Curated annotation (Swiss-Prot), chain A:
Gene: rpsS
The keyword RNA-binding is assigned to this record: yes
Keywords assigned by UniProt, alphabetized: Ribonucleoprotein, Ribosomal protein, RNA-binding, rRNA-binding
Function: Protein S19 forms a complex with S13 that binds strongly to the 16S ribosomal RNA.
GO terms classed as biological process: ribosomal small subunit assembly; translation
GO molecular function: rRNA binding; structural constituent of ribosome
Family as reported in the entry's similarity comment: Belongs to the universal ribosomal protein uS19 family.
Transmembrane segments: none
Residues of the full protein shown: 6 to 83 of 93
Organism: Mycolicibacterium smegmatis (strain ATCC 700084 / mc(2)155) (Mycobacterium smegmatis)
Name listed for the protein in its UniProt record: Small ribosomal subunit protein uS19
GO cellular component, one term: small ribosomal subunit
Ribonucleoprotein keyword on record: yes
Curated annotation (Swiss-Prot), chain B:
Protein name: Large ribosomal subunit protein bL31
Cofactor(s) named in the record: Zn(2+)
Quaternary structure and partners: Part of the 50S ribosomal subunit.
Family, similarity comment: Belongs to the bacterial ribosomal protein bL31 family. Type A subfamily.
Any GO MF annotation of the entry: rRNA binding
Entry's Gene Ontology BP terms: translation
Residues that hold Zn(2+) according to the record: 16, 18, 38, 41
Keywords: Metal-binding, Ribonucleoprotein, Ribosomal protein, RNA-binding, rRNA-binding, Zinc
Organism: Mycolicibacterium smegmatis (strain ATCC 700084 / mc(2)155)
Swiss-Prot record, chain C:
GO biological process, any: translation
UniProt record similarity statement: Belongs to the universal ribosomal protein uS13 family.
Name of the protein: Small ribosomal subunit protein uS13
Alphabetized Gene3D superfamilies for the sequence: 1.10.8.50, 30s ribosomal protein s13, domain 2
One GO cellular component, as annotated: small ribosomal subunit
Function, in words: Located at the top of the head of the 30S subunit, it contacts several helices of the 16S rRNA. In the 70S ribosome it contacts the 23S rRNA (bridge B1a) and protein L5 of the 50S subunit (bridge B1b), connecting the 2 subunits; these bridges are implicated in subunit movement. Contacts the tRNAs in the A and P-sites.
InterPro entries assigned to the protein according to its UniProt record, in alphabetical order: Rbsml_uS13_C (IPR027437), Ribosomal_uS13 (IPR001892), Ribosomal_uS13-like_H2TH (IPR010979), Ribosomal_uS13_bac-type (IPR019980), Ribosomal_uS13_CS (IPR018269)
Subunit structure: Part of the 30S ribosomal subunit. Forms a loose heterodimer with protein S19. Forms two bridges to the 50S subunit in the 70S ribosome.
Cited NCBIfam families: uS13_bact
GO molecular function per UniProt: rRNA binding; structural constituent of ribosome; tRNA binding
Keywords per UniProt: Ribonucleoprotein, Ribosomal protein, RNA-binding, rRNA-binding, tRNA-binding
Region (Disordered) location: 94-116
Curated annotation (Swiss-Prot), chain D:
Taxonomic source organism: Mycolicibacterium smegmatis (strain ATCC 700084 / mc(2)155) (Mycobacterium smegmatis)
GO molecular function, one term: tRNA binding
SUPFAM superfamilies reported in the protein's UniProt record: RL5-like (SSF55282)
Gene responsible for this protein: rplE
Quaternary assembly: Part of the 50S ribosomal subunit; part of the 5S rRNA/L5/L18/L25 subcomplex. Contacts the 5S rRNA and the P site tRNA. Forms a bridge to the 30S subunit in the 70S ribosome.
Pfam family for this entry, one: Ribosomal_L5_C
Protein name listed in UniProt: Large ribosomal subunit protein uL5
Gene Ontology, cellular component aspect: ribonucleoprotein complex; ribosome
Family note: Belongs to the universal ribosomal protein uL5 family.
A GO BP entry: translation
Length: 78, 66, 116, 181
RNA sequence: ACACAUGCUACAAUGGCCGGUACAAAGGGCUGCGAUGCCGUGAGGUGGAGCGAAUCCUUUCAAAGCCGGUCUCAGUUCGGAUCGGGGUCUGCAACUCGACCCCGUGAAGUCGGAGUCGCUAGUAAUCGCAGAUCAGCAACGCUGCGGUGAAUACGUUCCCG
């Protein structure tokens, strides 16, 4: 419950993105954190290994780690 | 009103826990109602509490407090 | 007796009679009955309406119950099923959410059995 | 008691304020409750013979009237019906029975239902009548809570002389009946 | 969407829950085991006594046991799956995928069809304990240690080798 993670590469990139007020689709490797509410509004191209899925970040995303707004497995059954 | 088929219909005295007392006609044989509810509706308060219930970004900033 | 909204039985002790509400289990009964002052060994036939008053005001004041808990949760489950989480996907498809075994067991989420 | 309590306050206060709100310009033009009818459920007809006497008894001692047993207009086949089976009784209230039923339920029945947030303002017909649903029962302290095995629900209708619908909202708002925007 | 297989927890009173109390064996420990004390409800936090250990630590070690109170046969003070909120610790990192604790939630399940398995005395049955692997753990596993401790075997006709 102490210092949470932060994704320092994504942290450096995110700050640059919001200082310039520029919004850009991001091809992001990171499945591990949506750390601050500074990430709100930025589109994240989440990488499940194989392709990048665009994810809009809103106010409810805070507290859910970044990777599984995009799922890694596919199942139908028939 | 027909005579014998209707149930007996008596005055009553309704009392709540705060003592706010009500006098009515009623069907109770006891002649009284010892109730726990008075004209103190909690919807006004319950609704406010429910409205107050949402909002979690603040809670997160709570855990993290800087 | 009558309370916050749960009809109490005929003959139960108080630390079990409080448990039949959605927000109260055994430990909350052991802490509520310690804070208010009602004996836990009291039956429901022997319960006082003033004890219903003090107990009722305590456990609607400092704790949440039936409507708060339920349309209360059920706002949090639909919260994570609206935003598109993976646990949202598990609640969508009717699968176990904690990432546990799905190959053989987890029959309590799939439910009754159809066999192909 | 010359006037029932709800009527004690209705005969002066709600009428004077409702004239304040609406300038009918004619006395007498000025809505009031006509009847309070209490339809009764069941639908267990054909399936179970005994219960309807459970409902006759149920309507009675919630209010002190012998509910008149109302039966089927026609035998419609899917939901087992038969022409002449009893399907729920109703009781029509007017006068001292109407007002003493109303004040009592108002200061007794409405608060008790668990998680009772309010009642919808929308539930009017075209002409000022309000109907709402009591799903279970045992909102009333008239019914002893161990006498009562299965929950029998009911509709309660207030029928007014309201030529509009906000007429009836205004009456039933000033009259002590709950609502929730 | 499934089907099999080995296990564990159960379906309650020879039981559950609260209080008091008695008895083990073996093991493990260096960037390890970590005490009294203090902060927590509790995982644990702060701290480092003391030990390369018949010495210190794992508390003087247990749990089932015994004494007492309560529960009165009920889908329950049985049962804990599931789900929500709130945490702690390990790790660069607990989303997909960790364990543990707190509050709530409280499902199936009323001894289980055909069939089938283990066991001949400290055995079966039941009760905890330690270890290896290991930062953490999917350990209910595996390997061991001890506690309490039965019934039955007339006998080779029948099944199996």
């Amino acid at each position: 419950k102490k210092g949470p993670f932060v994704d320092d590469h994504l942290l450096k990139k995110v700050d640059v993105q919001n200082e310039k007020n520029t919004k850009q689709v991001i091809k992001t490797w990171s499945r591990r954190s949506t750390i601050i509410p500074d990430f709100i509004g930025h589109t994240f191209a989440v990488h499940d290994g194989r392709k990048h899925v665009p994810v809009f970040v809103t106010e409810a995303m805070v507290g859910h780690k970044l990777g599984e707004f995009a799922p890694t497995r596919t199942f139908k059954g028939h | 009103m027909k005579t014998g088929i209707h149930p007996e219909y008596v005055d009553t005295t309704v009392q709540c826990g705060c003592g706010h007392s009500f006098t009515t006609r009623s069907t109770k044989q006891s002649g009284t109602i010892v109730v726990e509810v008075c004209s103190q509706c909690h919807p006004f308060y319950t609704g406010k509490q429910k409205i107050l219930d949402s909002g979690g970004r603040v809670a997160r900033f709570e855990k993290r407090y800087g | 007796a009558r309370l916050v909204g749960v009809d109490l039985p005929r003959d139960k002790r108080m630390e079990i009679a409080l448990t039949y509400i959605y927000g109260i289990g055994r430990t909350r009964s052991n802490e509520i009955l310690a804070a208010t002052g009602i004996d836990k060994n009291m039956r429901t036939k022997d319960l006082t309406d003033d004890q219903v008053t003090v107990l009722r005001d305590y456990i609607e004041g400092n704790l949440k119950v039936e409507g708060d808990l339920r349309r209360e949760v059920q706002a949090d489950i639909r919260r994570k099923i609206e935003i598109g989480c993976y646990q949202g996907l598990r609640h969508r498809r009717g699968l176990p959410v904690r990432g546990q075994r799905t190959k053989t067991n987890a029959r309590t989420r799939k439910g009754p059995k159809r066999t192909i | 008691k010359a006037l029932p309590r709800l009527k004690q306050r209705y005969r002066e206060e709600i009428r004077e304020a409702l004239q304040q709100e609406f300038n009918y310009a004619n006395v007498m033009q000025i809505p009031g409750v006509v009847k309070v009818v209490v339809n009764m459920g069941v639908g267990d007809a054909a399936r179970d013979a005994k219960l309807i006497n459970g409902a006759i008894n149920d309507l009675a001692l919630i209010t002190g009237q012998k509910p008149e047993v109302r039966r089927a207009r026609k035998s419609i086949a899917q939901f087992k019906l038969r022409e002449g089976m009893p399907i729920g009784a109703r009781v029509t209230l007017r006068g001292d029975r109407m007002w003493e039923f109303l004040d009592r339920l108002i200061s007794i029945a409405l608060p008790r239902i668990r998680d009772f947030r309010g009642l919808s303002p929308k539930q009017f017909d075209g002409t000022g009548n309000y109907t709402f649903g009591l799903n279970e029962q045992s909102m009333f302290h008239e019914i002893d809570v161990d006498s009562i095995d299965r929950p029998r629900g009911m509709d309660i209708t207030v029928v007014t002389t309201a030529t509009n619908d906000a007429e009836g909202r205004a009456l039933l708002r000033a009259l002590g009946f709950p609502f929730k925007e």
